[PDB]
Design a protein around this ligand. Sequence first.
Ligand code: CL
Ligand code: MG
Ligand code: MG
Lengths: 201, 201
Amino acid sequence: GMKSLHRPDLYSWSTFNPARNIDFNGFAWIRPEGNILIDPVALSNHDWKHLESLGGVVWIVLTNSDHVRSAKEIADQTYTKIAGPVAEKENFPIYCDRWLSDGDELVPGLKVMELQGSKTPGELALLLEETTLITGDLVRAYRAGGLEILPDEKLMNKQKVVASVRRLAALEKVEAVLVGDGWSVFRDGRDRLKELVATLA
Amino acid sequence: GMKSLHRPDLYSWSTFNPARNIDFNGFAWIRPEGNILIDPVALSNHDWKHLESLGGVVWIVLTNSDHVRSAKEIADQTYTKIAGPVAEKENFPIYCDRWLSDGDELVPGLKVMELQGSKTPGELALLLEETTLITGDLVRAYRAGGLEILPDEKLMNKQKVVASVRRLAALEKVEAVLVGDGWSVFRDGRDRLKELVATLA
Ligand SMILES: [Cl-]
Ligand SMILES: [Mg+2]
Ligand SMILES: [Mg+2]
């Protein structure tokens, strides 16, 4: 079900993937101005009732094409708009109302960053009010307690990946790193990103 | 599903708690000499098969009577023994093959601690190879990233609870704090326990 995180207006719900054996995580930011979902996996019946009670959904943000997940189903059931990465605008699996690029702010406090060198071009990462970073696939966590990157054979350009991760590690106020795949970090996120950079340096 | 944690031989599987938007968590320590479950929640057929492939179950440790959870059902389908807190031996909800006291070591490396003042007497906490603390109910986590205790209204004696937590905080090598209710801590566990103590001082 939808669990509250390190702040009372952020939730995550997940689908276990039997093939790392790893949890695929969706995220919700609940706001009076309109709730926002990120890389949403399927919502259970309970989860829908909870989400409707919290005010529904006005935006779904997708970090990359492999994270389309249940976005189409959720859009068909609501009046939400969908935002995706501008680098994948010409061949995206679903219709998006808006294409996001590095430096955009979808709503006040939700900043967009494009990462290079990943398995898809211009994979998005989101900075929510400076202290919460949300990643799609490039930064993930199979071993609980740390942060990892996608393996080398899935990368378009490892040099660009290291540069991307350094940019994330340079975000001065990051406390939490919420990950689309695996174990999210809720405290000392900047320190976990720093350790990750050291493994790639 | 059952997922590996901060070390590859520890797993957790969980059931959602709609009252507080957090999970109820079971834990498994996979060992050549016999697997150990702690406060086990229900196992799906898939999780069963996964556990079976890892060697099954030899012991279930229950930290307190309120975490009996799915222990009966698992006991009925396996030859597991069950261990519980000696302080509740006279009225426990299921038959136990062994009663644990403070200082006991169930198997080498799995040290037992009795906590005082909680909602049940002599609630157990477990210290696995000095660096992983596993708690039942007294220490839990609703806000992801920290550690909390049960509210005052559930405690038998707050003064004893504070002394019990101070003791947990005195375990010098703790990095992970696995909790029966809510968000487990995988890194810097001692520091989270120290912060919790500070809120009770
Ligand atoms: Cl089942
Ligand atoms: Mg993924
Ligand atoms: Mg409990």
